[PDB]
Write a protein that binds this ligand. Structure first.
Ligand SMILES: Cc1cn(C)nc1Nc1ccc2scc(-c3ccns3)c2n1
Ligand code: NI
Length: 332
């Protein structure tokens, strides 16, 4: 809703010594995603034009009223970390949200240039921004590095059960708490951070439980398409009249976009948590078909886990929700 009396300059959020640690880690049509350090403490920033009457990175510029949803979602999913009945951390925590004004900080264009050089950008260079330009700036806990980039780096299929378990547990709680669909859980939006912790903890509809961590702490991101309600008030991204999302493939990912629309009949207001099961199946696929493990499955026990996950893959599309998976499916 509000954090200030009006718009502020970039230096409020990104003082000099912070801007000098800013380093781009991701992007979308909305804008850009940078890592930095704040008081000895890493943080992901998300910067997003607003009220701009000109086209940015392709689409138009979301209004304040249009960007609010994402905030609400981000805040609500963060609260979960410290709730009681429906509790999970397997999302990412918002530390701050500020409306910023001015042209783009040159130091950040240096960071944007480096990204585009080593990796390539689908967005235009943000040098065309004026000094009257308003942005929103979301500052989050820093979750880790996404699964795609973490393929060679996983250790065993054990680790894969742990992640899938963690994701389901999270989505279940969000279903339970907020009636939540993520609607875009590509292996890009699943972060992993090493944790010395030996067991993670969550609570679903009042029941507490653990999940062996296998040295990893999974965090979910990118609430760009996500959905939820509190008090019968739904907050969601309408894509009914979008096309590109459902038209375009290569990877199995792109079939999910089609499948969701098949599920919900192109009415995106409605609550269909199968959407979460789909995305979970997609991820199980990824776990089985394009992951490469530091330890090889050549031991009777790692075979057993393999089988246990294949059986998960085939069986799981016949459950109605992450909740249902978590409770009912015999992987857990
Ligand atoms: C900033 C953020 C927070 N939400 C809920 N969605 C976000 N969007 C993106 C987009 C691309 C990438 S690549 C690494 C991140 C990280 C976020 C936190 N730690 S890393 C990321 N975040
Ligand atoms: Ni402030």
């Amino acid at each position: 809703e509000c954090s200030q009396k009006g718009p502020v300059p970039f230096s409020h959020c990104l003082p000099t010594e912070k801007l000098q640690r800013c380093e781009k880690i991701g992007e979308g049509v909305f804008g850009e995603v940078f890592q930095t350090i704040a008081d000895h403490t890493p943080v992901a920033i998300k910067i997003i034009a607003i009220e701009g009457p000109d086209l940015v990175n392709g689409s138009h510029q979301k209004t304040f009223e249009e960007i609010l949803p994402e905030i609400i979602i981000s805040k609500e999913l963060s609260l979960l970390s410290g709730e009681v009945c429906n509790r999970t951390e397997g999302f990412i925590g918002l530390n701050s949200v500020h409306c910023v004004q001015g042209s783009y900080p040159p130091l950040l264009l240096k960071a944007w240039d480096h990204y585009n050089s080593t990796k390539g950008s689908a967005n235009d260079r943000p040098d065309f921004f004026k000094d009257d330009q308003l942005f929103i700036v979301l500052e989050f806990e820093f979750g880790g590095i996404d699964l795609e980039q973490m393929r060679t780096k996983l250790s065993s299929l054990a680790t894969a059960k742990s992640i899938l378990h963690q994701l389901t547990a999270s989505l279940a709680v969000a279903e339970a708490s907020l009636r939540f669909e993520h609607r875009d859980l590509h292996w890009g939006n699943v972060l992993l951070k090493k944790t010395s912790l030996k067991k993670l903890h969550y609570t679903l509809n009042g029941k507490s439980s653990t999940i062996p961590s296998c040295g990893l702490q999974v965090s979910i991101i990118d609430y760009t398409l996500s959905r939820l309600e509190r008090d019968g008030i739904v907050v969601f991204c309408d894509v009914s009249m979008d096309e590109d999302l459902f038209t375009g493939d290569g990877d199995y990912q792109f079939d999910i976009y089609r499948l969701m629309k098949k599920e919900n009949n192109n009415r995106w207001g409605e609550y269909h948590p199968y959407s979460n099961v789909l995305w979970l199946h997609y991820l199980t696929d990824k776990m089985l078909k394009q992951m490469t493990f530091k330890t090889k499955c050549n031991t009777p026990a790692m075979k057993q886990i393999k089988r246990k996950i294949q059986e998960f893959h085939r069986t799981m599309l016949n459950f109605s929700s992450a909740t249902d998976l978590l409770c009912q499916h015999s992987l857990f």
